[PDB]
Amino acid sequence: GSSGSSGNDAVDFSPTLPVTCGKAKGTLFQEKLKQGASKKCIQNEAGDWLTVKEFLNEGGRATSKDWKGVIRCNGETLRHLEQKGLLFSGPSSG
C-alpha cells in the first residue's frame, strides 16, 4: 500500500532486493537465498517464486553461466553490488 517500506536506496536494509533478468522482473529474498541458489527466492510480479535459474529462463538467458551477471539490481548487477559490500549473496563461508 501507500505506506509500507521507506528508503530510496536503503533497500540493502530489507531482506528483499529488486532483481531483473532480460524481460523478467522479480525480487530476491536473502532469507530464501540463504538455503541455496536452487531454492525459489526470486519472486516475480505474479508472486510466483523462481529459482536463481528459473528466473533466468523466464527472461531467456537459461544459456547463462552466472546468474549474478545476467540478473541486474537497480541497474547494477548483483556481482557489482556484492563487491561494494551491498549484497550478501548467501552466507559467505570464506
Curated annotation (Swiss-Prot):
Disulfide bond sites: none
Tissues in which the UniProt entry reports expression: Detected in lung and macrophages.
Entry's induction text: Up-regulated after infection with M.tuberculosis.
Domain SAND, chain residue ranges per copy: 8-88
Top-level taxon of origin: Eukaryota
Localization, UniProt: Nucleus
Known role: May act as a transcription factor. Plays a role in the innate immunity against intracellular pathogens. Required for resistance to M.tuberculosis and L.monocytogenes. Promotes apoptosis of infected cells.
Disease linkage: Defects in Sp110 are a cause of severely impaired resistance to infection by M.tuberculosis.
Protein name: Sp110 nuclear body protein
Originating organism: Mus musculus (Mouse)
